[PDB]
Amino acid sequence: RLRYPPEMPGAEVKVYKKVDNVDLKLYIYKPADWKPADRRSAIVFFFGGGWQSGSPAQFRPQCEYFAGRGMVAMAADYRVGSRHNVKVADCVADAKSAIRWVRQHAAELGVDPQKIVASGGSAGGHLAACTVMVPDLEAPEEDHTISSQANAAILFNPVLILSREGLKDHVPRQDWEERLRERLGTEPKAVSPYHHIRAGLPPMIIFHGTADNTVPFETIRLFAEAMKKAGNRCELVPFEGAAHGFFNFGRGDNLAYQKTLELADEFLVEIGFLAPK
């Protein structure tokens, strides 16, 4: 199972953020025949764990796959509640710092600063969505003239609704909702991707199980329908009968794992970030 600190063999380690004497690392998997002058697409994975735990090792298999396909793939560490005195808003700031750091260092990374993909699972899928559509929550001392907004997103059963304001439906109480409002660090709408749907957003694809008992599928369905209405490319792929975490390497018989990769691959080829196989 996953361990923290993680082991990322063959990954180049770079500190992307220094905050509260914590060195937050990116674990970078470069493709074959990589050179700094390249202008490759990049993907940054944010692990899940309810903004409380988790490990960058979670998306290590996906990093190796997309590095094999020609991307600069990386897994970001970020601060979480069980290890650091942080709230959800602090995690968002770390995720944005990671995107900004990749863009800022795009020339030394061999990366096209306009082809940076944010990706993640559950809380990490929420963070990835925040880097494409949730305003502000930036580290105060960073260069805000360097955008922290990713150019696409690939979300694995993310959390996308963190407030109940304006919603015309009932959303069931969840264990992880354990008055997380005390650990949000902002008014809930300010960390709720659903509440910042608007035209002109980067394209994304979302994988979600219809039997997810942690994040109800309907919240993601409602999100995708509202994003389509605003003109955005937001493809929701239901996994029928799948539970929370279905996509992970090792779950089931890696069928959903392989399936999400081939769908994510096709999505990246569609939007011109990846060459066909």
Task: Give yes or no for a contact between 208 and 240, defined as CB atoms under 8 angstroms apart.
Answer: no
Task: Give yes or no for a contact between 79 and 19, defined as CB atoms under 8 angstroms apart.
Answer: yes
Beta bridge partners of 209: 239
8-state DSSP, 38? -
DSSP character string of 156-211: ES-------TT--S-----STTTTGGGGTSS-GGGG-GGGG--SSPPPEEEEEETT
Task: Give yes or no for a contact between 106 and 58, defined as CB atoms under 8 angstroms apart.
Answer: no
Q: Hey, what domains does the chain have and what are their CATH numbers?
A: 12-271 (3.40.50.1820)
Going by C-alpha positions, the residue among 80, 84, 106 that lies closest to residue 95 is 80
Going by C-alpha positions, the residue among 80, 178, 193 that lies closest to residue 137 is 193
Apex CA 104: angle with CA 132 and CA 10, to 5°?
Answer: 90
8-state DSSP, 242? P
Instruction: Check the CA dihedral 161-165-167-172 and report its sign.
Output: positive
Going by C-alpha positions, the residue among 140, 268, 124, 110 that lies closest to residue 204 is 268
DSSP-based three-state secondary structure for 124 = helix
* Alpha carbons 239 and 67: distance in angstroms, whole number: 25
Beta bridge partners of 120: 46, 155
Sheet containing strand 152-156, edge to edge, reads 12-19, 22-29, 72-76, 40-46, 111-121, 152-156, 204-209, 234-239
DSSP character string of 222-241: HHHHHHHHTT--EEEEEETT
H/E stretch holding 89 reads: helix 88-104
Going by C-alpha positions, the residue among 208, 212, 137 that lies closest to residue 172 is 212
Going by C-alpha positions, the residue among 219, 171, 231 that lies closest to residue 195 is 219
* Alpha carbons 208 and 158: distance in angstroms, whole number: 8
Task: Give yes or no for a contact between 49 and 123, defined as CB atoms under 8 angstroms apart.
Answer: yes
Helices 255-270 + 60-68 axis angle, to 10: 40
DSSP-based three-state secondary structure for 22 = strand
Q: How many CA atoms lie within 13 A of 64 on its CB side?
A: 11
Task: Give yes or no for a contact between 17 and 148, defined as CB atoms under 8 angstroms apart.
Answer: no
Can you list the positions of beta strands (E) in the chain? 12-19, 22-29, 40-46, 72-76, 111-121, 152-156, 204-209, 234-239
Going by C-alpha positions, the residue among 67, 31, 147, 55 that lies closest to residue 99 is 147
